[PDB]
Amino acid sequence: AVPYGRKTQHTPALKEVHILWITAGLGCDGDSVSITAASQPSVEDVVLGAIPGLPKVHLHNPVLAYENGDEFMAPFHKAARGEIDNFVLVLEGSIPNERINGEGYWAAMGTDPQTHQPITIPEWLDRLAPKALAVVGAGTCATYGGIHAMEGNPTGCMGLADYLGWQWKSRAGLPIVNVPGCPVQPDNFMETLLYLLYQLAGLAPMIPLDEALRPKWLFTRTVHDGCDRAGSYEQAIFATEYGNPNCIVKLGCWGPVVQCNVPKRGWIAGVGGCPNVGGICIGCTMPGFPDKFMPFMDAPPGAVLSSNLIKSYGPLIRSLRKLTKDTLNDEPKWRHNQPVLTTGY
Amino acid sequence: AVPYGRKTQHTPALKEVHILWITAGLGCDGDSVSITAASQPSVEDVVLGAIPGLPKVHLHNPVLAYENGDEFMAPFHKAARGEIDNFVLVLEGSIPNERINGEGYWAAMGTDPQTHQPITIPEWLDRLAPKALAVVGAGTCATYGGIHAMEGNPTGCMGLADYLGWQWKSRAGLPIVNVPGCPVQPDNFMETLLYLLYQLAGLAPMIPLDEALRPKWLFTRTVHDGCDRAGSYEQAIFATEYGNPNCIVKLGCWGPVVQCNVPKRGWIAGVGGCPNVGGICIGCTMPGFPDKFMPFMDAPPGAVLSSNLIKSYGPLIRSLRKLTKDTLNDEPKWRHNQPVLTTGY
Amino acid sequence: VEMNWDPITRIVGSLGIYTKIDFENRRVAECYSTSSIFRGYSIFMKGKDPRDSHFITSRICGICGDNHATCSVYAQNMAYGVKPPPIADWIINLGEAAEYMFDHNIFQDNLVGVDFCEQMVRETNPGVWEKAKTAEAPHAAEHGYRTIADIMTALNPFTGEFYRETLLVSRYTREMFCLMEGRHVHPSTLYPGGVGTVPTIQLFTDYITRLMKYVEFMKKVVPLHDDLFDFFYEALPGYEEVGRRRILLGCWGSFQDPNVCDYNYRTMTKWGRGMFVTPGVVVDGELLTTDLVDINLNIRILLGSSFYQDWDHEETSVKNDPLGNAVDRKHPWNQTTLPRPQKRNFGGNYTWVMSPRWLDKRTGDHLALDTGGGPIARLWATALAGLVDIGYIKSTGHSVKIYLPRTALKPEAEFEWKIPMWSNAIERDRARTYFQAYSAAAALYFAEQALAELHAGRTRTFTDFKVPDEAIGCGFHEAVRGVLSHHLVIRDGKIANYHPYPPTPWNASPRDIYGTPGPYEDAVQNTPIFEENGPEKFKGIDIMRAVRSFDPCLPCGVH
Numbered sequence A, B: 001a002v003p004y005g006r007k008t009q010h011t012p013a014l015k016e017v018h019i020l021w022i023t024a025g026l027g028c029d030g031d032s033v034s035i036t037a038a039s040q041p042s043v044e045d046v047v048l049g050a051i052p053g054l055p056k057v058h059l060h061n062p063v064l065a066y067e068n069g070d071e072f073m074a075p076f077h078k079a080a081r082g083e084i085d086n087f088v089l090v091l092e093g094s095i096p097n098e099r100i101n102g103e104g105y106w107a108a109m110g111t112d113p114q115t116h117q118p119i120t121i122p123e124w125l126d127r128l129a130p131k132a133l134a135v136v137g138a139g140t141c142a143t144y145g146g147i148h149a150m151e152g153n154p155t156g157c158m159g160l161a162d163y164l165g166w167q168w169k170s171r172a173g174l175p176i177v178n179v180p181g182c183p184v185q186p187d188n189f190m191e192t193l194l195y196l197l198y199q200l201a202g203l204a205p206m207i208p209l210d211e212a213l214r215p216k217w218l219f220t221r222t223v224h225d226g227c228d229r230a231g232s233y234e235q236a237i238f239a240t241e242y243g244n245p246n247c248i249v250k251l252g253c254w255g256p257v258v259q260c261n262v263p264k265r266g267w268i269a270g271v272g273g274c275p276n277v278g279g280i281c282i283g284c285t286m287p288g289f290p291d292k293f294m295p296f297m298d299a300p301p302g303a304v305l306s307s308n309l310i311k312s313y314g315p316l317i318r319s320l321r322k323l324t325k326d327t328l329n330d331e332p333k334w335r336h337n338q339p340v341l342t343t344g345y
Numbered sequence C: 001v002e003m004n005w006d007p008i009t010r011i012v013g014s015l016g017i018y019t020k021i022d023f024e025n026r027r028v029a030e031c032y033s034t035s036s037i038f039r040g041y042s043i044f045m046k047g048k049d050p051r052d053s054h055f056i057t058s059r060i061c062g063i064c065g066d067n068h069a070t071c072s073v074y075a076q077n078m079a080y081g082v083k084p085p086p087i088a089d090w091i092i093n094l095g096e097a098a099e100y101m102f103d104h105n106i107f108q109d110n111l112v113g114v115d116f117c118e119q120m121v122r123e124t125n126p127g128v129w130e131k132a133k134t135a136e137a138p139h140a141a142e143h144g145y146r147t148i149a150d151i152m153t154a155l156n157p158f159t160g161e162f163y164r165e166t167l168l169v170s171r172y173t174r175e176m177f178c179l180m181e182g183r184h185v186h187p188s189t190l191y192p193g194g195v196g197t198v199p200t201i202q203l204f205t206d207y208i209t210r211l212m213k214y215v216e217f218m219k220k221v222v223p224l225h226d227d228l229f230d231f232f233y234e235a236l237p238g239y240e241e242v243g244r245r246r247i248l249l250g251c252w253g254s255f256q257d258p259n260v261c262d263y264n265y266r267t268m269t270k271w272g273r274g275m276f277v278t279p280g281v282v283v284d285g286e287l288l289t290t291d292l293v294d295i296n297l298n299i300r301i302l303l304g305s306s307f308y309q310d311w312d313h314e315e316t317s318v319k320n321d322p323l324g325n326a327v328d329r330k331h332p333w334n335q336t337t338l339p340r341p342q343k344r345n346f347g348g349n350y351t352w353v354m355s356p357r358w359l360d361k362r363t364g365d366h367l368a369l370d371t372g373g374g375p376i377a378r379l380w381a382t383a384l385a386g387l388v389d390i391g392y393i394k395s396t397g398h399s400v401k402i403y404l405p406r407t408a409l410k411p412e413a414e415f416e417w418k419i420p421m422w423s424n425a426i427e428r429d430r431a432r433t434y435f436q437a438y439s440a441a442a443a444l445y446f447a448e449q450a451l452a453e454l455h456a457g458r459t460r461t462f463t464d465f466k467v468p469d470e471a472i473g474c475g476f477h478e479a480v481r482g483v484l485s486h487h488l489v490i491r492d493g494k495i496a497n498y499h500p501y502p503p504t505p506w507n508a509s510p511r512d513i514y515g516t517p518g519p520y521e522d523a524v525q526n527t528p529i530f531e532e533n534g535p536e537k538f539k540g541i542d543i544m545r546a547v548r549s550f551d552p553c554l555p556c557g558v559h
């Protein structure tokens, strides 16, 4: 009864995988909420294993989980002991500085019966991190510290690299995987997770990351490289007020120097965006975010130099486009309802 | 039993509307097949009145029609007998010159109930157009003559405005409504069609159109002003072969002088397009199409000029941005797990 | 018996519920709620440019951030003395309406729904499952589910037909949202003085097209949930008692009228009224205020049970409002957050969540006003006002009339939400579904207004402004989970003080100095135990159904 063609069905190198999702870092749960917007692939696509041949995925995420309280945490505590040999660690939110304390906590999950003492995020990390197949950073907070690692913050928090080391490799040789963004672009994360499910199954090579440990195929090109308002930039036409359809670099957009794919990719099903729809890029996917971008609605100094640049040839190269567009908005002479044919036949 | 909300529902100026869709032009039915792909609004959305307060829609289109043959042509014949008043005439395909014949025909749809001869496209237009509430051209063939009004074509065909006259008006005051594109972009047409359904219900002003009888809000801006490769254009980075992610003007793209929203808008549900995904723009929405654009894969003459010029400041501004991006890939110094906080708090 | 669950899942943020429950009598003696995350927005916001507020405050939460951005942009509008073009606030309303439609739908049928699904009911009340199979749903004609037991199975996570569907519904409602505000949850096109969204006939076409699909979906979902909730009222007579409290409801208004709103503190009384969700404190079955200035001045943040040192000896910044009124010290405008990290102890100090209360001028009481969800608080206030006349939404006095016109496959529908007589867990959840129809209804009206502005040609979307060297500002806006306020202070052209107070902060708060319980506590205390299990395997679903009714959101709660 075993149908010919099942021979195309090859068992994954890793039969199953556990995804331990810590949302109790310093942050909102925006990256968890965001990924439920994905379609390429969707989050139910991944759990129900819509794409065959990949490891069976077990998703342990507080926001969606069926288990509750102490039973939800049970898989977390088990892995800590070394009982689990197939879990990837996902952090969402930044890592608090607990050394500046103290007899308290900035962030925590799992009150523990060991002493009736809440575990801190730093304890969880170097408890699970060195036993994991891979550690994933979900959101600019967990990757680089983000908005909460702002100048003047009380917690003195940081990203996963700050805490573990930028050269830190997992027990399976996988460097820290950083998927930045605030929040993470839905498809971006699901593309990266899917890539990891492929790599672990044996069907793909080591995930190509960059120096900041970002997925190359998502974060190499800059925002400006994919912005459709870039025409009006070349032609020296810059928006005077928000809402205008032209380039908004003088209005706050850091797009020319930020590594993000949103304008090119869209936010949800091609719909959303930032500067391509009149929202200035505030550089939310960068390590320097947000301090190296504020005040947001001010022009980037670099833009000021390049904006003020005199492109003399501008208005006449803008002329032949006009002149050429006019010859192209008129039909050839042989299109008429006259008694004789004049096409050339 | 009438609820208060009913006061919000208003009766459309025109209670019902017929759309007579003559596909028997020198066309290929691609514009018809195309609008089935739309979703904003969908064809079945219009047919079932998803949006309240609009004229009841009876769509008479051969590709979808339940009715067959003589029953399908019934409402057509009845409208040429002046026995139908609220119908909109849509044409798809080029209008042929039947004056260089002769016995026979280039194109025919119905059959003459008396002479029992095929009815030519010009004959259908004379009987229907002056009675129609509005005359809509669907596709570049029906608007400007399109690919079939090419140099050397045996039928000597043309577009609506050519046959009926550029300042032609219906008996409701509406000018010829040209919707260019080869094929028409799915949501482009349904939006035009939807606008007309709003106007007839007296819920919106006359359809704003340009001197070529194109909807303004759809065909004002050029391909270029909405191309997410414009970025690589401004930074003078042009592809030299075809699978290349940067500007392709040197390879055939007419985007800078072509009026179309495709790259900005996507093809279907934001997914496709032309130069934005690596397919040169061949100006298929322009009166000059296709003759003024051939050969397609040769770079347009006006292109050679533009590309050379901006090779000047290209290098500097590129390195300015690369250096700035470097600074942005570095976190602020106050992110670390040291014993003492250094954030400012 | 000491039964506690921490962290609580299927909510946003890390929450912990510790309790003392009397099994022998089926009662909950005490209760104590606690968060575990502190980020300190009020702290690092100080000294920053005011123009950055809405971008930063949006990150307060990953599910409702657009509400803070909106609420923040409201306040800057006040401070900078600027009124954005009329079309810009229609756009912002259309965006926020989609935010309601998205959030309540994802939360109702994917987070709180799991509490009602087969798998849970067959782990909590194996008997009720047996009962459920033979109960035919009163509205199977509208939602196609024959029995309540079928509906329940349709909610099993990932396998349930309706579970999987609402995920889809949360995507195109977010698409809608993104058409108006750029991206979700943190907006990109929102600014003080207007928006960056380009108004075209396409923009409103793509929104209306998706809206109509959400409307028809609600014709199915309203009856679908009434039947499931009416069931528990019939299945377990008295269950109404679970998660109930005195009618202590807050509603600080929602969608705004550019015809009237100029964003001045003085005229704030007036255009406070004409908001398409009437603001007001309801207490209890009775309605006190039509005025936000009235309700604004009476807000006090207490600290009986929180990890802060209190700002006794910290300098005030605002003594009077822009209209001369007196301003309190424990009011957010004059608040100073001193974070005090310390060991947990439910005797006195056990939560990062402060204890906001309200002041009744009539009685001198500082009651723990709640939102309930808070689509429940919202609907209650508007019904009484009898002030909103939108057609799609109409206020009588005894109720509010929600009308949804004919879609492609269904005819008209009207949903009259009558005052529930009770403020319980189920009636909350019942309210959440009804407000989704409210949002969809309201959104239909805003789309009209917007198109007029567009057809008129008035398409400017931004009005220029200047940042004052000395100013104050208040933002009032109903978030998804209820009342949301943003109090801003500007000194030396910089942010001197900024405190956002979302709905959760109230609901999750502990008891004030006066010792009045935290809005969960009182609701989770008065909560009976209709459960069918004893402590040993007992998972305590009845308390969870109570906390989740409030629609908790701990990032908003501590910020």
Ligand code: NFU
Pocket (backbone or CB within 6 Å): C012, C060, C061, C062, C063, C064, C065, C067, C068, C479, C480, C481, C482, C484, C501, C502, C503, C504, C505, C553, C555, C556, C557
């Ligand atoms: N809705 C909502 Fe939030 Ni995560 C709350 N509570 C707030 O403004």
Ligand code: SF4
Pocket (backbone or CB within 6 Å): A026, A027, A028, A029, A030, A031, A092, A093, A138, A139, A140, A141, A142, A146, A147, A181, A182, A183, A184, C059, C061, C062
């Ligand atoms: S990166 Fe942004 S969305 Fe994600 S946890 Fe941080 S503030 Fe939230």
Ligand code: SF4
Pocket (backbone or CB within 6 Å): A223, A224, A225, A227, A228, A229, A230, A231, A233, A246, A247, A248, A249, A253, A254, A255, A256, A275, A276, A281
């Ligand atoms: S709006 Fe931004 S990304 Fe777009 S072309 Fe301008 S500076 Fe570049």
Ligand code: SF4
Pocket (backbone or CB within 6 Å): A181, A182, A223, A258, A259, A260, A261, A262, A263, A273, A274, A275, A280, A281, A282, A283, A284, A285, A286, C188
């Ligand atoms: S602000 Fe910039 S980096 Fe952030 S999602 Fe938008 S385009 Fe990307």
Ligand code: SF4
Pocket (backbone or CB within 6 Å): B026, B027, B028, B029, B030, B031, B092, B093, B138, B139, B140, B141, B142, B146, B147, B181, B182, B183, B184
């Ligand atoms: S405009 Fe193009 S798609 Fe339409 S009939 Fe002509 S050749 Fe076919």
Ligand code: SF4
Pocket (backbone or CB within 6 Å): B223, B224, B225, B227, B228, B229, B230, B231, B233, B246, B247, B248, B249, B253, B254, B255, B256, B275, B276, B281
């Ligand atoms: S590929 Fe074409 S439309 Fe695109 S930026 Fe280049 S010349 Fe312009």
Ligand code: SF4
Pocket (backbone or CB within 6 Å): B181, B182, B223, B258, B259, B260, B261, B262, B263, B273, B274, B275, B280, B281, B282, B283, B284, B285, B286
């Ligand atoms: S070839 Fe040009 S005009 Fe035609 S669909 Fe493509 S972008 Fe539009």
